[PDB]
A paper describes a structure:
Gasdermins (GSDMs) are pore-forming proteins that play critical roles in host defence through pyroptosis. Gasdermin (GSDM) proteins consist of an N-terminal pore-forming domain (GSDM-N), a C-terminal autoinhibitory domain (GSDM-C) and an interdomain linker. Recently, GSDMB was shown to exhibit direct bactericidal activity through its pore-forming activity. Shigella, an intracellular, human-adapted enteropathogen, evades this GSDMB-mediated host defence by secreting IpaH7.8, a virulence effector that triggers ubiquitination-dependent proteasomal degradation of GSDMB4.
Author numbering:
A (entry chain J), B (entry chain K), C (entry chain L), D (entry chain I): 2 to 69, 81 to 91, 112 to 174, 194 to 233
Write the structure that this text describes.
Amino acid sequence: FSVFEEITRIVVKEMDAGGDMIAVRSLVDADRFRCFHLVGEKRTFFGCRHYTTGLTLMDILDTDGDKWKAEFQILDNVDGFHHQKIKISENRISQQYLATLENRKLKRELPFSFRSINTRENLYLVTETLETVKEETLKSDRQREVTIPPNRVLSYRVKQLVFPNKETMSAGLDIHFRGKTK
Amino acid sequence: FSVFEEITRIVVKEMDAGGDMIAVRSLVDADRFRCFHLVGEKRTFFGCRHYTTGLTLMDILDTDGDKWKAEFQILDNVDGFHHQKIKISENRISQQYLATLENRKLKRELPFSFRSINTRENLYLVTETLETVKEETLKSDRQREVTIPPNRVLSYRVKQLVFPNKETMSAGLDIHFRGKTK
Amino acid sequence: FSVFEEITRIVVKEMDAGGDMIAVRSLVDADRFRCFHLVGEKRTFFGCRHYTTGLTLMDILDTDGDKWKAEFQILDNVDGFHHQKIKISENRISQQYLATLENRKLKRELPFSFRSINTRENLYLVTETLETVKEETLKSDRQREVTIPPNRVLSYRVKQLVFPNKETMSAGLDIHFRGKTK
Amino acid sequence: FSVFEEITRIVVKEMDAGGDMIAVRSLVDADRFRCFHLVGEKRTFFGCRHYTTGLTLMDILDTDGDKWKAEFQILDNVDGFHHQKIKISENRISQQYLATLENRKLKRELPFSFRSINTRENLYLVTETLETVKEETLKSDRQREVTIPPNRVLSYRVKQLVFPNKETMSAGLDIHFRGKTK
C-alpha cells in the first residue's frame, strides 16, 4: 500500500543493489532531515522498520564549517504496479569535511541531552547530500498516486559517532548495531 | 460513513505510513485547534476514538514569542469509494522555538485550572504547522460528498508537557500514555 | 418522516462524528434559541428526544457585555432518501467571554423563577454562534420536501450553570446528567 | 533484477573474456572511485560479492605527480532481456607512472589509519583510467530500465600494495587473496 518506502528502496536498490544506503519513512521533517540529524530507534516489526526523530545537531561556528553533481532522473515503473518519476540533485560535500566536523568542538546546552540519554540511539550522520527538487506525482496500485514537493530527500547514510559527557569521538565502520556504554 | 476521519487518516498515512501523526475529529474548532491547544481524553470505543476540547494556551508576551513550505496537493481517490481533493499549506516553525516556549514563564488565571484538574488529560502540543486553505468539496460513497472551508487543519502532533502548580516542565519522548501525578 | 432531525443530525455528524454537539427539534423559537436560552427536559421516548422551552436569559447591561467565520456550504444527499442544501454563517464569540458572562452579576425578577423551580432542568448554554441564512427548500422521501427561512439555527452546545438563590456558578465539564440540589 | 552488475560484467567480458578486470557495485561514489582508492572486503555470499568503501589516497605533491584513447561504444542487447547503450572514454596513463607513485613518499595523518587497521583489506589500485561520459538510460527485463549520468566509471583493476608503519612496498602480481601481516 505505502509508496514512499517503495520509492526510497527503489532509490536504494538502483543506487546500490541491497547495500549500504538507508531509506527514510517520514516526510514530517524530510527536507530538514539533512546532515547533522537523527533517526528513530530500530525495531523489526513488519520487517525492518525504525522510528523517526531527526532533530538538529549544529553546535558551533567559529572556524570554517559552513562553506559551500548534475541532475539525475529515474522515470520508470515496477510490475501491484508502481510508477516512479523521480529527479535528483546532488551537492558534493568532501569526505575530509567529516574529519573536520569531528575536529569541531562539541559544546551545546540545547534541550537534547535529556532525550538523547533517555533514548541511547547512538545517532549517525549522512555522508554526501542526496537532494530531490523533482515533480509532484507518482503512481501506485493495490488507485492511490502519491505527490511529492520539490527540495526533499529520500535516502541517507551512516557515520556512527559516540557522545561522552563533554567531547565526542567517531565510529566510521558503519556501526549501527546499537551497542555502546553512553 | 464518516469522511473526515478518512481524509485525516489519508493525510496521516501518506504523511508517514502509520506513524507519529495524529488526526482530529471535530471541526467545531478545527482552525483554532492550532498550536497551544488541547484535545479530549482518549477512549477505545469503536476503535481509537478520543474526545475533543482544545481551548487556548497562550500565557505571556514579554520576550519575543510571536515572531513570524510551498503549496502541496493530494488529488486522488480510494477504492466503499472515496475521493479527496486536498491542498495543504505549511508555515515553518523552528524546533528550538519549542524550547523557547518551554522557557516562557507560565502564569495565568484563566478559568482553565478547574477543568484541567478535573480532567487530568496531560495536554500535548503540535510540532510544526499543518494548514489547508484548499477547496470545498470531497466525495464519499456508502451519496454524501463533504465540503470543507479554507484555512483549516486536519492532523496534529505530540509534545507532552507536565503542569505543576506554578511552573511547567517537558516530556518530549511522545508520551501520551496518560500517566502522571498532577 | 421528520426532516429537521435528519438535517440537524447531519450537521452534528459532519460537524463532529457523534460528538459533543446537540441538535434542536422545534423552530417555534429556533432563531431566538440563540445564546442565553434554555431547552426542554430530556426523555428517552422514541430514542433521544427532549422537550423544548428556551426563554430569555439576559440579566444586566452595565459593563461591556454586548460588544460585537465565512460562509459554509453543505450541498448533498443521503441514501428513504434525503437531500440537503444548507448554508451556514458563523459569528465568532470568545471563550473568555463565557467567563465574563459568569462574572456578570445575576439579578432579575422576570417571571422565570417559578417555572425554573418547577422544572429543575439545570439549563445550559451554547459555546459559539451557529447561524444559517440559507435558502428555503430541502427534500425528503418516505413526497415531502421541507422549506427553511434564512437567519435560523440548527445545533447548539453545552455549558452547565447552577443557580443558587442569588448568584450563580459554573459546571463547565459538559454536565447534562440532570443532577443538582437547586 | 540488478542491472549495474550486468552492465559492468558485460564490460568486463567483452573487455577480456572472464579475465583480470574487476567490476564495481555501488555508484554512491563511483566517479570518485578513481585511481588512488579502495574497495570493500570480499565475501562469497550470493556469488562473488564484495563490500564497497573507496576513500582517498593522495598523500604528497612535491615532485611531478599530477601531470596530464578516443571514444568507444557498446550498443547491444543480451537475450531475461537486457539492453546496453554504453559509451566509454579513456585517458591514457603510463605504467612507469605506477613505479613513480610507488617511489612517492608515503606520509599522511588522515583519519584512515584506524579504519585501515580495523579492516586489513590490503587495498589495491587501478592500472589505467576507464571513464564513461555516456548517455543516461539502459533497459532490463525480469519493466525497470536504469539511467546513468555522464562522467562515471564501471570497472577497475588490481595492483596490490602493502602498508608498513611508515613507508610502503608493492605486490604487482595481481595479489588479492587477502593474505598479509600488516
